[PDB]
Every structure is written in C-alpha cells, then in structure tokens.
Design a protein around this ligand. Structure first.
Ligand code: ADP
Ligand code: ADP
Ligand code: ADP
Ligand code: ADP
Ligand code: MG
Ligand code: MG
Lengths: 432, 96, 76, 445, 438, 433
C-alpha cells in the first residue's frame, strides 16, 4: 500500500557507507563517491556518538548538487533514532512569535535528549463495591483474577473517587505515593451490553496477578520540551500548538540544574544530538553572532551546517564573506568540502535512483542520461528518470529506452534551455 | 508550580529540603494583586473616576428559527463560567 | 445607557458548519491532544496490550448466565 | 558539567598575590597585561563601592576576550552574580531593546538574604488547657495556656502556648497522634499530616500519613537565599499564586515579558534598602558581560549612557573584535570598535594581543589535557605549525578528530600522521576561501 | 554595609551650587565651573519652582564631557523629591507596546503630580485591655470592648461588629500601640509598649519597645495623597490598570480618558480639592528622537498640563533621524524655535583639577599633588572621564601594594594597563588587518 | 491656572461685518486669515456641509495653531473640537486609517435627552426569593416602598455588603447599586463601628430625572464594539483578555448611524457636527492622504482644518515625490487654503506686550523695544520666551518690572537657534556627528 513516507530526493540513502575504519566504500548504503567528505562525516559522527565534547560546529560546503544534504541525511540515518537529530532550514528561525535567538535556543535545546526513568508503585484492580458513610469514611473493594481485598478510605481518597465518578465494574489504577486515580476501563458483564457508548468508555479484561504492582516508565524528552512544560501552567499544550513564546532564561537555568540533579540521582540520562541547519546563508548577522557564543555552552549539541554559496554578502550587512558566514564563526567550525561528481559517479547515482524508483533502463539509456546529467545537472537527470519511466509505461513498454529519454528531454526543459528560450522572447516576459 | 521565583513551593513541612531554602523576607517583597489593591485602596477611592460616555450591552444575534441547541449551550457555558469566576472578581468591585 | 444592537440573520446561516453524523467520520481516532492529562503510558504500553478484550471472551461473557450472587461477609 | 566546552580549562586569572600575571597559570597562557587589568577590575568588583563602571575588551578574534571574562567570573565565584549576554539578544518580539538591557542590568545586581527559621516539630501526644482556679466573670471556665506535647525520634517536649492557638488547632483539626509544626516567628500551627505509626496496611490515604519527625523538637537554622533585583521585579510585575481573577488570567494567558516601570523598580530598591538596613540582606553587586557589543544598535548604545551613569548599575564588561566598522542603526557612520565615541569615552579599554607560536602550543597542550587526549611531541609541534598558519581555533579543534582517528587505528596517543590526515579531511577558513575564489563561477551568488 | 545606591558618575553633584542671586560659586555642591550654564540652569529651576508657565523647553548643548548631565542632575537634586523629575533617554520611547506619541505622552504626564490634602480623625493610643465576646456556635453578633491609653488619657470604647472584625484580623493585643482611622476603620499597628508574658512558648525574641503616645486620643491629622497624571490615566484606563502601574502593559490610553482626567483635575483645582505640582521631564540624548517624535513635542508643549522639558545633546549639524535633513543638534528648526539653548564651554586645567579633587573626595581616595598634576594632564590630553576612571583604578593599584596615598607610579601603571580611545585606535590601526571589518 | 502658549487667544477678533480688528481677542495681525477663519466658523455653525477641508499654510510662528484655537474659542465648548497631531496615526494597536476614522467620529457630537430612574432609601427588608431574586424595602423621609429586583441587583447589593439599615442608591437604567452608608439614626449605638454614616434621603423612594448627555459617535462605536453594559461574566472576560483597541467595522458605524438617526427622529437627540484639527499634517503618509480623500468625500464627515509649515517637501511614505506643502496635489485640490504671513516688528511688539500681560509681567517701554529688536532677528517665539526669565531676574534684584539690563542679561545667558548654529559651525570638529 501507499504509506505516508514515499520516494523522495534522499530515500535511497541509508547511511554513510563506511567500514569499521571509517573508510568510505565506493558504493555502499546508497552513497556514491565523495570519499573524503564521507570520511569527514563519519569522523564527526563518531564525535557525536562519544558525546564528550560540546558545541562542535561543522560546515558542509560545496557546489550545488555535490551531495551536502545527501551527506547530512546519511549522517542522520547512520545515527540512531535514539540520538536526537533536529534538521531545520535557515529560514525557519524567522518567526513572528519569538526572536531569532530564541528560535536558535529552542533548536539547540531540541537537539539534546533527556531519557527519564521513573519507577512507581501502583494499585491495580477492578472495583467491586464502593461504600461511603455519612462522606467522612468509607471502604473500597478491589479485585483481580487471583486476588481481592478491601481498603479503608479517607477524606481525600473519597473526594477523589467521587470526582472521577468511580463505580462498580471500573478497572482503575491508584498511585500509592500521590493517590491519583486514573480509569483504565470497565469490566464487561451481561448487563453492560450498551447500544451506544461514550467517547472515552472502553471494555477491558480484569487484571491478573497481584493488586500491588510496580510501574516503570522510560521515555525520551528534549530540553526544549521540559522548558515548554514548565513555561506556563499548561505548558504541555504549547508542545502541540507551538505558541511557546520566549521562555525565560531563569526557567532554562532551573531546568538545567534539575536535569543535572536527575542525572546524578540516576533518574535521567543525557543524549546530546545534532542540529542540522541547511542553507545557513539565510541566517542574518545577528543569528551568526548568537551562534558564536551559543556553541560555547556545556549543553550545546553538534551543529552541522551546509551552504553552497561562494564569497557572497552576509545577510543584514554589506560585507562579503567566503560562505556568507562571518569569518569569526568560520574559525569556530571545520569545513567539509564536496567535490563535483565524475561520469562514473553520476552513472552510479542514476543507477541507485532507478533501483530506488523501480525503473528498468537500458545501458544506452543510462549513457544518454549520464551525458544529460553532466551537461545540465544531476537533479535534472534524476527527474528525467521518472519522466521517462512514465512515458515508457504509457506506450506499454517495460524498459526505458533512449527514445523515452529524448522524449522527456524535449518535453521538460532544464534551466539553460528555458533561459535561452526566454531570451529569445525577452520582451514578452514582464520586468526584465 | 512557582519555577524560578523568590517564592518557594508549598513544602509539606521541615522534612522537605524546600522548607529551609526560602525566606519570609523574600516572600514579603512579592505582592499579590490583592495586596496591591489593599495598598492602593485610598488611591482607588480618590482617583478612580473616569466613566465611559456611553454604555451598551453586547450585540445580540437573532434568527427566526435558530438551532435549538445553541442558546442552551451558551447559557450553560455562561452559567458555569460565572459560577467559577464571579467570586474571584469581588476584589475589583470598587474599581468597577 | 443604550439598548444593544439586534443583528438579524437568516436561520440557515447558523447551520452552515453543521454536518449530520451520518455524513462525517469520527475525528476522535486522530485526537492526540485530548489524551494528555488523561491517558498514561502504563495504559497504552503495558496494560492494554495485555488486557484487551477479544471477540471470544465478549461472546462467552454475553452468552453465559448471570454470575452467582456475591456471598455476604463473614467475620472469620 | 561533565561535557567539555570551549572554556572548560579556564579556572581563573593566573595572577600572583601582587597582581603580576604568571606566564601560564589557572588555564590561561600569555595575555599578561590584559590579565593584570582584569585582576584590577576583579578588585574593583569585589570592593562593591562603584556603580556603572564599564570595561571594553578589544582585540582580534581568538585572543581570550571571552576567556578573560570567564576568568573574571571564576575569580569572583558563584556568590557574585555574573550575567552573560550577547548583543543580538536585545532584539526581542515581546519587549523593547532598552527593557532587555535594563533587565540584564538588574540581573547583574544580586541580593543575599539571611534569616533564621525556628520551628517546633512533633507528634501531638497531649492537648491540655491550663484552667484558672478563679474564672474571670465568675461563670464558666477560663484558660491561660494550652499545653501541647510534641514527640520526635530523639525527644519529647511540652510547650505552654497562648490560649489563642485553640482556634488554630481546631481550624487545622489537630488531634493526638498528628504531626504538626509551629513557627515561632508567626505563632501559627500547621498540621503536616498524621503519624505513620497509626496507619495500617489496609489504608488507602496518600498524603495523610507522614513519618515521625527525626531530630529534636526545636529546630532552628540559618537560611541563606540569593536573589537578584530582576527576580523581585519579575515576581512583582507578573505575580504568581493569587486566587483573584487577575492571577487566573495570568495563568491562562501566555506569559509575556513586559516593560517593567520605574515605579516598581523604585519600590524594589526601597524594599532592598530596608532589608539591608535591618540586617536581613547584604547587597552583592555583580557583573554584566555583553559579548558582541557591536551587534547593539545606536538606540542601545545611546541608552547605555544613561544606564551606566546610574548609581545602581553593575560593572559592565564589553567585548568587540571589530575594527573601524559601521555602527548598526546608522547610515555610514564608522567608529573604532563598532561603538560610538560617546560610549567609548565611558569605558576603560583592555587590549588583547595575538599569540606567539609558543603560546599557541601551550594553549593546544592545555586543551589536549582538558579533553583527556594524549598527544606526542612531534604531533604537538605539527599542530602548532598548523596553528601558525590558519588560526588557533582550527588547531584546537583538530584534537578530538585526531584522537578518534588514532583510537580507530588502535593507538592511545595522537601521532603526526593522525594530525596530517585530519588536516587533509577538514579545511580551514582560508583554504575554503581559496577554493571558493578559484571556482567562483560554479558556486552560487 | 553598601546600600543599593553606590558611587556613580554624578554621585558628587548635590545641587547647582548657586547663591541667592543665582550667581554660581566656583566650586560648591560638587559643581565646578560652567558658570554661565549653571546660572541659566538656576533661572530655569526658579521657573520650575514657580510652576506658572506650562510647556517650557530648554536645550543643554555642548561637547562631550562638558557637564550637561551633571547640570541636569544638579537641577534634579536642587528640586527635591517633592517635585516630580522624570529622566529618560531618547531611545526609551521606541516601544513595541505603544506608539512613540503615546510614550511621550506618558513621559509628560509622569512629570505632573496631583496632590489631594484632607483632614481625618485619628485615634492613637496604647491598648490596655481588649475584650471580645462571640457566640459559641452559629452566626451571631459579636460584642466587644476596647480600652485605649495615652500619657494623659484613657477611654473605654464600645466596639461594633466591623471594628471587632478589624481588630480580630489585625490580632490586636494588650500593649500594642495602634492607630485607628474612624472613617475607614483601618487599623495600623506601630509597635508594642512592653513585652508579652514570658511563660508563653514559641513566641520568639521580643523586639524593642515603643514609647506610649502622648496628648489626646482622638486627634485631627492631615493626610496627603500624591499621584501623577500618568498614574491616574493608568488606573482609569481599565479595571486591571492598577497592576499596569507596575507591569507596564498599559497599551495605548484612550484620548477620551485623558481629556476626562484633565477636566476633573482642573475642576479639583478650581474647587480647592487638589493642587497640581508641575515637574520636569529630562530627555537625555534627544537626538535619538525621529521627526514624528519632534513633531509631537512641538504641539504637546502647548498644553497647560505640560511640564518643563529639558533636553541634552552633543550633536552639531546632523541628520535628523527618520529623514535626510541636516539640522542643528539633530533637532528640527521648528522645535528649536520653541526652546532656549544653554551652551556648556569646555573645562580649563584648574576646573579639571577641581573636578578630579571632588571625585577623589567622593570616592574616598587620597592622592598626592604630583599625582593630581599628572592626572589633570592626562584628563586634558585624553578626556575627563578617562581621568575619573583612572582615579579608582590607581586607588585599587595603590591598595594592592599596601599603600595609603595614590602616587604618580600608580597613575602611570593604570595608564599602561587601561587605554583611552586614542591609543586603542592607534594600536588597532597598527593591526588593522587582524580586526574583522574596517 | 498655568499659562500656556495660547492662553491669550480668546477669539478671532472680528467685528459684526466679519472684518478683522487690528488688535482684538489676543490677535494682532493676520487680518485676511482671521476673516477666512470667521467664514469657516460660520460654515461650521451652519451645520449643512460635511467633509469640508481647510489648510492653514505659512511659515512657523505665523499663528496657524493660534487661529485654529481661536476658531475653537469662537465655536464654544458645546461644539466638539478634536485636536490631533499627524504623528498620532502611527499606533501599534490599530491601522492609521482606523485612527483617522476614529478621530473623524470624535468630532461629531450628539446631545441626547435621557431619563434616569433612581431607587434611593434606607434598607428596611432584604428578603431573597428563590437564581434568587430579591424583595427590598426602602424608606425615605417622605414614605416607604417595597420593590422586587433582578438577581443581578441582588448580587450587586451583596457585593456592596448592603444590610438592613444602610442607605443605598440604585440606578435602574444601568443596574448600578451604590451603598452610601449606615443610616445616621444608628450612629449613636456604638463608639467605634468602622462605618461611614449618611443621613436619610429626604425625597421620594423612586425618582425620575431627565438630563442632557453629551456624547460623540466614537463613544457609541466604542460602547458597541467593546461592550461593558451587560454586567455579565463575558463582558469582564472580554475587557480583561482583549484590552487593546480594534478596527471598528463599517457595519458597526452604519448601525450607529441608523440608531442616531432614529434618536434624532424621535426628537430626543440633537446633532453637533463639530470640527477636527490636524496640526502637523505633513507627518501623515501617502496612505493617510489617500484615505483622507474618501473620508472627506463622505457625507457624514465633520469640518477638518489642516495646518502645515513645510515648503516644497517630500511626502512621507513616498521615495522622492515632492509637493508644495508636504501634501499630495490631489488632497490640495480638496482643501481651502488660508495663508498666514510673517509679522512686522510692530505686530511683534504688540504680541510681546500681550504675552507679557497674560503672564502677569510688567515690562518697561525701553525693555519692550529692546525685546522687539531681539525678536526682529532670531524669532518672535524666542523673544516671547525671554519674558519669564527676565521677570525672575528682576524679582531677584528686587525690581517689580523688567528693565533693559535684565533682558540683556537673559539674552546673554540663553542662545537662540541661529547663535547655536553659528557655534556648531565654528566648532564642528568638537561636536559629535
Ligand atoms: N554521493 C551521493 N550518493 C547518492 N546520491 C547523491 C550523492 N550526492 C547527491 N546525491 C543525490 O543527488 C541529489 C542532489 O544532492 P543534494 O545533496 O541534495 O545536493 P546539495 O549537496 O546541493 O544539497 C539528491 O537527490 C541526492 O540524493
Ligand atoms: N590566553 C589564553 N589561555 C588559555 N586559553 C585561551 C587563551 N586565549 C584564548 N584561549 C582559548 O581559545 C579559544 C578562543 O576563544 P577566545 O580567545 O575567547 O575568542 P574571543 O577572545 O574572540 O572571544 C577559547 O577556547 C579560549 O578559551
Ligand atoms: N562642572 C562639573 N562639576 C562636577 N562634575 C562634573 C562637571 N562636569 C562634568 N562632571 C563629571 O564628569 C563626568 C562627565 O560629565 P557629563 O555631564 O557626563 O558629560 P556630558 O555633558 O557628556 O553628559 C560626569 O561624571 C560628571 O559628573
Ligand atoms: N496674530 C497673533 N497674535 C497673538 N499671538 C500670536 C499670533 N500668532 C501667533 N501667536 C502666538 O505666538 C506663538 C506662535 O504661534 P503658533 O500658532 O504656534 O505658530 P504656528 O503657525 O507655527 O503654530 C503662540 O504662542 C501663539 O499663541
Ligand atoms: Mg541541499
Ligand atoms: Mg551625558
């Protein structure tokens, strides 16, 4: 069937294709070439996995189409889902709700995972009888498939039971430490054959075993989530809406201290992760200035960045800098350069894309498509793969031939041909 | 609930470390709105005088055959909100 | 003091968004934010996978006669 | 804390008792004149008799300006407030830039409050009124004391209290066997539950049963609480804990920073002065560190004149690596550090110089020691040569990749080959710029 | 112990230092030199104190470090706390919560104080015996009796239910010195004339006692309530306005509210209920205002509720913010016509030395004559503020070497350690490539 | 009373034929401009035309704002006069066009007859009637009456803590309950009660009073856009959660127009079209001017007076479009331009003397001539502002009148704009920027 995840621009990438020595294979896990860049990415990935050093910045630089985002996706795939990997674009920090520095702080704190581990004693059973005398004192009877006992209730327990409208046949759990009651469901009897059911009622089997049980919950949350939870009374709602605003720095410091306390007590573990900012040249000079000192914290993840700009203008200034990034930030980061692909690498990438899309192409078609990709661009050839597959299927064919590739080359234009055709009719277009 | 404040949370008693962390001096330097109102009672009585020139009830929506559930639902919502919030608005009585 | 503004509109306008239940699907199957503060990780992860009802158990309980009356407590 | 950051090796300024700077001490190498000036500034901060004094750390990038500020913070200690700040942070979507600057100013001024909390703990064993043999008015019974017996783990004491506590005891529903505490400074009785020794395994109450208190019945301790003026300002501007409709609105509505008025800040100043005079509190004026001050605009710089001229302001440390740059918010106005000359007249400038190769090698060795990395002499010399070209930050950033490469190769130390391979894998700013210039057509924009 | 207010830039300025004829002394109350500017400031201060002319504007213009802010602070200290003095910077009017015109209106209205004077009956005495009889169960009428004592009187009062409730809430006991306002029934405890019984436990350490009040019990005292126009506007704008007095968050106040308040305050002034205490608004660095703000200032000074406006600027012929127009002082010529300008001349050598001496006296720093000469030379060469900073720098250097008097060696040491703008710019030119953007 | 910059302006100083007297009502010159303003005043008094715009044009100090305030004084306090500065449209809450529209409606006033129903008396019985109504008994010096009131009034009475024996005031129109005090008859029962006593009302329990209310169209718009008359929880919620101004729709203004027309037809309302005055019109931008086109073309708009001292100046909001007064030529076609001229030295002396009399200052003839000469150079504004400092100097020296020496001393102490410009030019290298 068709799931929500479909064939994208990087669906063929499963990893960085390295061995135990971080030496890149020529074609492994969906990556071709870029040997030096892939080895550097693997070294950075080992640095991420160790987690000892905080606030390390790497910039993946190269010409368009040279595999920078491909390498970032390979790093993300090779890194486990346990370790956070926040991938944002440079434009996403320009928010109408929070400042650029606040957006970058939230992105930084989203890249650090906190795995919690809480062990709690609970009472779990089916309610048999609730008797309350008059509401000062009462008794509650709970049962399992192997047990049954009666409990003496106080004022607050009676109030909590009456507030939740707990009655016979309800399967509930009670926390011993706090006394909070949550209703799991109700038992099914012959008399509960309802014709209409409420939106929250559900029938469950009576629990087995012992009435007293231990509940162990292990979950991974980020620092930003803990910040949002403690920002306001119902701050967990902002984790859905996103209406977080600018969280106070004092709250963040309190949470850092509390998280350190949890880490000392054994109730939490820190998993520093990666923040990938793609197309960083969209960041303004203020954002770069904030990044300069944000990386210097002890709770800063690894910042992987990617730009394809030459010596260009920094946004918000009139200055020219080698990547659009001020030279002060560039001294804080290691640069991984991606080289242009050769004919063999282009053909291998086309083969991987065809295998990913389940398209059969002849060798002459592969040669023609590689020539087109070298002449125009690799992404144009990748798109022509699917275009030619569709055209071949239209004529009831099974393998894409050179005629299909030529047909889709004539139907769909790259940038160069379109620009030439526009220059032919320049006066027709608007605002030249 | 009071995260990062000079006011400490409601410690159960001296057995809790939070009991011996916060001071009453820090508590007395933070004034609740009720304390502010008690502090400005003379000012409220002497200097609060501005009245709107015109006063109107909110615009009402009328249809000949409305959905018979809209009005009772709005009435119940208003009744519950009033029963929960009107006692909390009593301190502002003199200002109004 | 002025009387309020009486804004009169067509009665059909107030039913514009209303959709009959037989014409709309249940959106509670995608309700994630409603579970917060009401549903626990225990219920979702540990309890329900073990104590979900089956059709066989439901049919057996429905067809079986009423259970015997609960015995009265005895001080023993 | 366990993770190693960029300034994890800075443990203070390596100053002799006479103020002269040692060549290498406390994690700092070189910068002797700047370190001596920062020590004088530390003495100024500790003297606590000056307000609004500003210091500008001026020098090329990577010359220890932030390291010097953090060394100052280490010298002061955790008692003295130290509020770091970058110039980009004044641009907020909620409050104006001047409000952000004022809030950071109030964050830098700390207050230490010392109080004694005297309490009486115990499980109520006895509750006996002390009647008088001569009832006032002739009829009925009059009481002059209420004897309360409090029992703890290691003692039992009886307290003859005021008769007025009878109402508090009834309101709290205090009976025998309940654990209560009475505060001397207020004369109020609080029932912290019932003793756990009277609880059976068949009870279901959660917060009702409490353990019998340990220690003595009479517990008194000195509470030291550290607060800042900004804490009091924020707690009073948006108060939390009321039961009126306004507090409910505050809880409901999204929190938002507001422009705190001079009235509230003056009230806070009066309360702080009252506490200081009473002996409850001691003022702890700290430091506001504003890194990348050049990112402030002309409005912020202009406001800083009035901010620094105040008698309540902290000691502000600036830092800027800019040359004759254009002030932000102005059209083609150039100033020596990106800072208008009016603000430069109000600051003392500390100059940071570039590092010699020997100092760079020492800093690299210190960073390798901090990161738990063993580096050979030849590898260290090669990395120092790499640091002579490129920059110092580039060399110190090759230590952990080279260590990882050595560990993969199966070696416990970094050799020269590892540093060479890492240098081949990763490019510095200058090499990347050379590549970009050589291929400017193939790159974008 | 150090108070919240410490030695600042203008901590030595206690006033303008003028005589009865407004003639400036050479060195008095911290001010040194600036004779013409101080005389002009004194004339403006007399105009403020008279409080008869609304919307007067004065511009203090001069080179940096010539004492413009010193003169403003001297005026503020000579005015006293009775007259409002709102000092703001030009940058502070740019706010995301309100318009620039609204911020200027609030600043203007913070500089005018409304004072209400009324006489109330007040009972002040020592509580001898208080008795309160209340029903044991159920709602009932509490009956009580209170005895109050002074040095020359003692009266027994029959208490009403609400006074009983007030006394119960305040927990008034025997020996408490209390104040009772007959109208509102408010009770304020101001001390204890003697200790409580010793046999009681959990009472705490008894504080010092307060002498019993003398004279008659029920006196007549004058109560003064003073608020500014801005406070009235804020508390009248909305129900939650009183919290906006502390949180800001006033938004934009309706013009109707301000017009009603102006009318009511005028009515009070005619009816003798309240007196208006006009003050001063001091906008430092007024050149940060844009053309719209200056245009608002032009007409806002034409109101009878406007205070005296004092501006300071060190700009020459400069572009007006928000425009491309060059104007004197960065201020439009239309506004410059509505104001008198007070120029500050540079300081001489002797004035600089006297300023340094006053600063050393304020900082409790002892300095030698040779050190004073060297410091005055440095201040003339570099700037006055640099020498002022070197004062305490050399004090700290001298204290480090276990000295008592600041010598020339300490001044040279701090001159070497801390650089001025000129030497820093020279050293930056020497390494121009090392710095980032030029 | 404090003396402001225009406190001497009491009128236009016109005769019965409309001609301008030389010196009258605190005005010295501008005879042509005063006659034009008199014609504009008659136009405003006619209450026939809508959206007629007038531009006062001239150099600064030529009394444009003085002429606008003189028009206001001629009209009277009954006719609305809304003074706004062009810089005030740049609000952070509502759009500039909304600010302009609101200021337009503020200029139109409405005198409406209203009847107030009052229940005033001492409470003798407060019996709830099960939502619980209240049965209340009120007594005055003339009689006693029992009333049945809504539960909201009972809640208000409870909030006021009204109990048997208290003197209360109830407004039946607004449902506003005010407890005034415990009746004076009970002031002898105790010695300390913490109560404020009030005498028994001497009229009837139920009174009806007819009063005239002065309101504007903007007030009605605000009352119907941010309602607070229901006294329900929703009104409090809306006030607390939404305190900012909103962009009132044209639909609400049409409804208010219908209501006011109905009131006028019923004979209980009178319309006063009124005047809007925009002083620094050049501070408006091209969007404001374009909106003002349509706003002035409206048949509801008031008479708008504009002022400007700009010459051929770039219109705000445009890049480089330059127009004669800072006002685009399209709007200048819709205005009547009144031109103000510069003052002769004789007129300057007359104005100085008038200002001296207004400020209660005695000035000698020699001092008056010297100050007029000072005003010939510099400006008239500068010369007028030297009167109070010279008076203070004379008072310090023991003189009850200003002599020439005091004026010279003050002019030496205080510089003007031209002198300061000269100082800045001579020392450009020492001043900042
Ligand atoms: N080394 C590679 N191996 C496999 N696919 C690649 C490689 N490099 C690029 N691609 C593919 O080519 C396309 C463009 O590469 P991408 O990394 O997105 O360009 P850029 O580096 O400019 O972001 C993507 O579909 C990507 O999957
Ligand atoms: N003199 C020094 N001694 C020890 N470490 C230093 C010294 N100077 C710089 N560093 C370190 O080198 C790195 C460069 O940062 P830094 O010098 O603070 O840059 P900047 O001065 O531009 O803020 C930091 O890790 C800093 O701690
Ligand atoms: N005439 C003076 N008398 C006393 N102190 C002065 C005088 N002039 C300047 N100062 C002091 O020297 C410093 C610089 O003067 P300041 O008024 O800040 O200059 P500006 O005109 O730039 O505001 C301040 O600390 C000020 O108190
Ligand atoms: N014809 C006049 N007669 C008397 N006083 C005048 C006259 N014209 C102007 N003034 C006064 O001189 C000052 C300047 O006039 P103003 O109306 O402010 O000029 P502008 O046209 O610049 O607004 C004000 O105090 C005003 O009252
Ligand atoms: Mg990409
Ligand atoms: Mg100044």
């Amino acid at each position: 069937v068709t799931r929500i995840e479909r064939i994208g621009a990087h669906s063929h990438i499963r990893g960085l294709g390295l061995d135990d020595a971080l030496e890149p294979r020529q074609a492994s896990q969906g990556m071709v070439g870029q040997l030096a860049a892939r080895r550097a990415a693997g070294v950075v990935l080992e640095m991420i996995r160790e987690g000892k050093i905080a606030g390390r910045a790497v910039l993946i630089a190269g010409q368009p189409g040279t595999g920078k985002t491909a390498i970032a996706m390979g790093m993300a795939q090779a890194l486990g889902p346990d370790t956070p990997f926040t991938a944002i674009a440079g434009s996403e920090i320009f928010s109408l709700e929070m400042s650029k520095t606040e957006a970058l702080t939230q992105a930084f704190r989203r890249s650090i995972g906190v795995r919690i581990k809480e062990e709690t004693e609970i009472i779990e059973g089916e309610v048999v009888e609730i008797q309350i005398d008059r509401s000062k004192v009462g008794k509650l009877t709970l049962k399992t498939t192997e047990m049954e006992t009666i409990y003496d209730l106080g004022t607050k327990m009676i109030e909590s039971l009456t507030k939740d409208k707990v009655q016979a046949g309800d399967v509930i759990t009670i926390d011993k430490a706090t006394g909070k009651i949550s209703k799991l469901g109700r038992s099914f009897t012959r008399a509960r054959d309802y014709d209409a059911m409420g939106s929250q009622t559900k029938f469950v089997q009576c629990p087995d075993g012992e009435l007293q049980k231990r509940k162990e919950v292990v979950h991974t949350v980020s620092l930003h989530e803990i910040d949002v939870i403690n920002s306001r009374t119902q701050g967990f709602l902002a984790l859905f809406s996103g209406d977080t605003g600018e969280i106070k720095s004092e709250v963040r410091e309190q949470i850092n201290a509390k998280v350190a306390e949890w880490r000392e007590e054994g109730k939490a573990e820190i998993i520093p992760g990666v923040l990938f900012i793609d197309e960083v040249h969209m960041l303004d000079i203020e954002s770069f200035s904030f990044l300069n000192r944000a990386l210097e914290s002890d709770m800063a993840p690894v910042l992987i960045m990617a730009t394809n700009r030459g010596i260009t203008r920094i946004r918000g200034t009139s200055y020219q800098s080698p990547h659009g990034i001020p030279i002060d930030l560039l001294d804080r980061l290691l640069i991984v350069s991606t080289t242009p692909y050769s004919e063999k690498d282009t053909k291998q990438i086309l083969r991987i894309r065809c295998e990913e899309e389940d398209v059969e192409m002849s060798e002459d078609a592969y040669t023609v498509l590689t020539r087109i990709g070298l002449e125009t661009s690799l992404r144009y050839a990748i798109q022509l793969i699917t275009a030619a597959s569709l055209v071949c299927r239209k004529r009831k064919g099974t393998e894409v031939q050179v005629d299909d590739i030529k047909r889709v080359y004539s139907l769909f234009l790259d940038e160069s041909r379109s620009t030439q055709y526009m220059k032919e009719y320049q006066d027709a277009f608007l605002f030249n | 609930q009071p995260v990062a404040s000079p006011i400490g949370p409601r410690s159960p008693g001296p057995s809790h470390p939070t009991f011996w962390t916060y001071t009453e001096a820090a508590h007395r330097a933070v004034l609740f709105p009720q304390q502010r109102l008690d502090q400005l009672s003379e000012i409220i009585e002497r200097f609060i005088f501005v009245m709107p020139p015109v006063e109107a009830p909110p615009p009402s929506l009328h249809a000949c055959h409305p959905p018979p559930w809209l009005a009772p639902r709005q009435a119940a919502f208003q009744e519950q909100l009033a029963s929960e919030l009107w006692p909390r608005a009593r301190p502002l009585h003199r200002i109004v | 003091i002025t009387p309020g503004i009486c804004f009169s509109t067509a009665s059909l306008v107030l039913r514009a968004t209303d959709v009959h239940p037989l014409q709309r699907i249940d959106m509670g199957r995608f309700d994630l934010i409603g579970l917060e503060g009401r549903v626990s990780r225990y219920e979702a992860d540990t309890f329900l996978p073990r104590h979900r009802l089956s059709r066989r158990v439901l049919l057996e309980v429905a067809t079986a006669p009423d259970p015997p009356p609960r015995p009265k407590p005895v001080k023993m | 804390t366990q993770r190693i950051a960029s300034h994890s090796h800075v443990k203070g300024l390596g100053l002799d008792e006479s103020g002269l700077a040692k060549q290498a001490a406390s994690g700092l190498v070189g910068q002797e004149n700047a370190r001596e000036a920062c020590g004088v500034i530390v003495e100024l901060i500790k003297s606590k008799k000056m307000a609004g004094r500003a210091v500008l750390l001026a020098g090329p990038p990577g010359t220890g300006k932030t390291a010097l500020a953090l060394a100052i913070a280490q010298e002061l200690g955790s008692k003295v407030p130290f509020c770091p700040m970058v110039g980009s942070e004044v641009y907020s979507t909620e409050i104006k830039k001047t409000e952000v600057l004022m809030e950071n100013f109030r964050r830098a001024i700390g207050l230490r409050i010392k109080e004694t909390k005297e309490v009486y703990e115990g499980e109520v064993t006895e509750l006996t009124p002390c009647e008088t043999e001569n009832p006032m008015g002739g009829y009925g019974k009059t009481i002059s004391h209420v004897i309360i017996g409090l029992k703890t783990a290691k003692g039992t004491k009886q307290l003859k209290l005021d008769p007025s506590i009878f109402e508090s005891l009834q309101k709290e529903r205090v009976e025998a066997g309940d654990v209560i505490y009475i505060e001397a400074n207020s004369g109020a009785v609080k029932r912290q539950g019932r003793c756990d020794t009277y609880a059976t395994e068949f009870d279901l109450e959660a917060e009702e049963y409490v353990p019998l208190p340990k220690g003595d019945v009479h517990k008194k301790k000195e509470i030291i609480q550290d607060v800042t003026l900004h804490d009091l300002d924020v707690a009073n501007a948006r108060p939390q804990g009321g039961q009126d409709i306004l507090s409910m609105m505050g809880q409901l509505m999204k929190p938002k920073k507001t422009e705190i008025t001079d009235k509230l800040r003056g009230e806070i100043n009066k309360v702080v002065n009252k506490y200081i005079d009473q002996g409850i509190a001691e003022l702890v004026p700290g430091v506001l560190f504003v890194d990348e001050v050049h990112m402030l605009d002309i409005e912020c710089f202009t406001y800083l004149h009035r901010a620094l001229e105040s008698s309540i302001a902290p000691i502000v440390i600036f830092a800027s690596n800019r040359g004759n740059c254009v002030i932000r918010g102005t059209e083609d106005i150039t100033s020596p550090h990106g800072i208008p000359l009016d603000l430069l007249d109000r600051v003392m400038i500390i100059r940071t110089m570039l590092y010699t190769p020997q100092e760079m090698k020492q800093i690299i060795k210190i960073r390798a020691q901090t990161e738990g990395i063993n580096i050979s002499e030849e590898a260290l010399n090669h990395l120092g040569e790499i640091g002579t070209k490129t920059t110092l930050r580039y060399s110190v950033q090759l230590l952990t990749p080279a260590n990882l490469l050595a560990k993969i190769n199966g070696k416990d130390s970094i050799e020269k080959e590892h540093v060479e391979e890492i240098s081949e894998l990763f490019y510095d700013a200058k090499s990347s710029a050379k590549i970009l210039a050589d291929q400017q057509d193939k790159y974008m924009k």
